[PDB]
Amino acid sequence: AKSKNHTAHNQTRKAHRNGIKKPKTYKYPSLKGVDPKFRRNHKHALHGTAKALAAAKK
Amino acid sequence: GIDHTSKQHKRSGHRTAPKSDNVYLKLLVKLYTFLARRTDAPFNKVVLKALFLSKINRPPVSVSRIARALKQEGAANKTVVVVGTVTDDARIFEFPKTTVAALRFTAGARAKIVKAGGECITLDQLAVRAPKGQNTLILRGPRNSREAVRHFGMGPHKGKAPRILSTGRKFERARGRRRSKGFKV
């Protein structure tokens, strides 16, 4: 009793019933996979500029 | 026939009129519907829409949260509006004088406001004093802080609170959570 193995029919219609959605983008992207040294120095620089801004403008 | 580009006879997906059978709530809903229909202030429409929210969509607002909101610049002389229930927080010690309008008030929160020097009014009184919502500030509680939303969206490499009954050792801490017994999540 053989049976049909594989077919791509109606798959495109099934995927298009719920429209294919582009990923939601944000102003600040994820910081994973980035160079650890760059991330550490970015953290230090961010702390420094936050402190400078707090000291300057209150 | 029409090659429809969207679903036919589809509902708006929003809740019109409360699902509850509270007579006082329906009366308040009618009053705010009249306001939002015969006025131009978006505050009335926002309050009317929030009045239809469910229990899970209407989390309680604490007196500490009210004080934190009023601590903002220029918010000291404003009327707090909570569409729901206002609870009492024992972790705070100094409550400034204010005017909070909400549907239901916890006895402890009401006592705290009365002792501080404020008053507890209802939505009808708030509407009477400010028909257009002048000098008001709407407060909403944390909706994603419920314990039932942590389990939502569970999947591998997500860490989304697997649905369990008991907690401790040998309860979903075996293979599938450690690298020593195969794979980690």
Place this chain on the structure above:
Amino acid sequence: VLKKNPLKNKQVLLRLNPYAKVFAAEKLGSKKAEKTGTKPAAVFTETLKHD
């Protein structure tokens, strides 16, 4: 309550277009053009019948 068709109801046509009265009065729908006469060039005349 009901849509009345222009070009068949004169009242609705006049309401839509106030210029309709002037158009009808001046009979602008049948206007005689200037009686100018030009002769095609011999080149075009020969190209028309050139087989």
Place this chain on the structure above:
Amino acid sequence: AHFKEYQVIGRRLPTESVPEPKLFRMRIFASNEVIAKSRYWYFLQKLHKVKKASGEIVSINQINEAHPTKVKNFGVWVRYDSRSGTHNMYKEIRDVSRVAAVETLYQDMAARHRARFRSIHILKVAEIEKTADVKRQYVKQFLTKDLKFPLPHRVQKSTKTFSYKRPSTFY
């Protein structure tokens, strides 16, 4: 349909490299201006490297017969694609106008060689001004002097589905 002669003059799109492109004119028998332009473009992109997107029509006009009330003999050279191959023919028609002559030729070819309008290509239409170069007997037989031929077995048309008298086909 009722074929009409349209002469179309076209040219390639002007370019800075070659200003004032050459103008090509062709006469086509077509039902309307759209068909005439389509046939003009199709014939142009068979002898010249041109296309509709890389060209334009500067003029299109309708040619009327100079003497449509005079009976003429027309010789038409045609090339057509049959069920097996392409063949060239020369047919002689007798008509008062070129459009009528080519319509008769189209009906003749579609009825006798099963060639459709997509198959018959009009190579050339000319008028034989001397009644001595005709080489077709079916045309020559109608140029004889003192031509009198009767119409035997005349068939009449009746407006009623029943007739009370036996019809006669005299004439």
Place this chain on the structure above:
Amino acid sequence: GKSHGYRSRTRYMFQRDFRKHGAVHLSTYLKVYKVGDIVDIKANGSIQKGMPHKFYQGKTGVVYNVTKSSVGVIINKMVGNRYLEKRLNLRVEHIKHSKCRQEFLERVKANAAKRAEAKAQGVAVQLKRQPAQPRESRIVSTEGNVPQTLAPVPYETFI
């Protein structure tokens, strides 16, 4: 059985061009890559380290990470009924700059220059591009360009 590997059916894809084998020209290593730059991906057969997959050949992506000799590219891959982001680290060799972005910066600079110059007087800046509008009216003169009559040629049996 069946074979679906990391380099399956790339015989004509991961292959150097004709008369272009050997080492790589010393220009790719001198290109500066920064975060946010849009680059294209084209695998090179000489270098087999950091080679991209078959799907990511010819795709265009933004740069999100800079390493010693590599950059990270974010590529939107269509799986099922959604687009998923893929952060893949590739060597400098199998990556080239995209000229569409450069044309965009050039258009932006011209856009700002025109916005300054035209608005110095304030008349019809028309900073937006337009498609190919239909051609306007024109007059052709048959001075030395008399139209030549053309007729279909008879069928020929040339061999």
Place this chain on the structure above:
Amino acid sequence: AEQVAAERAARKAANKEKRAIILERNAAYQKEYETAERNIIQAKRDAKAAGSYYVEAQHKLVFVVRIKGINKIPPKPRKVLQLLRLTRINSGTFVKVTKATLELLKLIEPYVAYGYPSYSTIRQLVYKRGFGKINKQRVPLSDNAIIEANLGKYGILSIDDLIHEIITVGPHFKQANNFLWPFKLSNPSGGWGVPRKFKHFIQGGSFGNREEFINKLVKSMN
């Protein structure tokens, strides 16, 4: 409470002023139309007389009607039809001629018939089956007040102004066309004139570009 007469008189005065402006603008538009038509005719005449040929500018506006049902349609042409607002059979829209629009029409040519419209048929269409889109509703246009209210920001305040914007493509042609609901026409009164609609116009059918011949079909269907 006797000020009703005062507001009535003020409303009448404002309406009369508005009607005066409408009449002046309509007269100007009619004069421009006559001048343009006569200018084209005489330009053709001088070009013919001076041993030359007058190449008319390509038409900048077309009318496209759908002659095919909503069944057995490939997905890309179906999407193009939806983007062109042709979801019912015997539905027509106006299209400005550009490269993008021409390539769009070249894709759904098998299911539509399009051609260059004339002023008379444009006016007849707008007068008879002219419907606007206000609050996502098909409100019929039986007065210039609605047109002015929904299009006054673009300088269009009357049905004649809308017709002018349709015939002559201008700065606000996109908004003018978007404001108008697609025209739902009926089957032709005198018939399609061909035995098989789904064949090209050169091939003897309604499918394909009809150029100036679209006017007769549009008026028969309207």
Place this chain on the structure above:
RNA sequence: AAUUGUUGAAAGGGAAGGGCAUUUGAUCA
């Protein structure tokens, strides 16, 4: 109710039964 006998009414050229509209017969506000 299935089934059966009489009375009263209708139909019946190798089926009956139904729907779209009407004539005729019986009955009905």
Place this chain on the structure above:
RNA sequence: AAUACUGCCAGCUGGGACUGAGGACUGCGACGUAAGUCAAGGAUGCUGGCAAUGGUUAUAUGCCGCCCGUCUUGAAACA
């Protein structure tokens, strides 16, 4: 000059069929110098006949109409 063909008329008019929804006024227009009128955000006036029309059922006529439920890509099947 006329005529054939195409396109336009915010040119006129003859004949026939379907429809009468809405229910004191509200608006946009026209005629009328002005009263007032109108084919202008959905039909009224007059007159005639009866106090048969029409509802249910049976037969007849023109057309259409395969046996209910399940399995199946496929049922009415000689499943």
Place this chain on the structure above:
RNA sequence: AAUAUGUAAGAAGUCCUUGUUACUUAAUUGAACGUGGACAUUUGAAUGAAGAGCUUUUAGUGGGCCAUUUUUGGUAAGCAG
């Protein structure tokens, strides 16, 4: 080649000045994040959009077939793929 296919066609942008870093550079030399300041008609190609985005739950489904075109096995098949 055609068809099919990715990316860009802007305010999450561009430009001027200069604050931070434990990154880097011979070096205030580059990189990131910034503060202040300038550019709203025509916000940067056309068209469209009973609005778009996001979360929870779950019924049934996991034997298909046929039609145009491309095409495998087979001589062919209302054959299989």
Place this chain on the structure above:
RNA sequence: CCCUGAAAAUGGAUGGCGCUCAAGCGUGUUACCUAUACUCUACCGUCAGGGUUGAUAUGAUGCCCUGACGAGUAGGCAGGC
């Protein structure tokens, strides 16, 4: 175009009757008939956009205005006997 090639078993199929300057064959032009298709109108239901506590007067889940749509197995939801 037609003819020989061209022979299968109950009695039968351009549906048949039948048709011969066809009612057969190719092409060109008009008129004519119709789908639950298209345009308008009347009614029902659904959805969307709104008005209506200035009342004796009640059902603001009530009333009214405008626009669009209405197929369907398994299955889901809602309103009702």
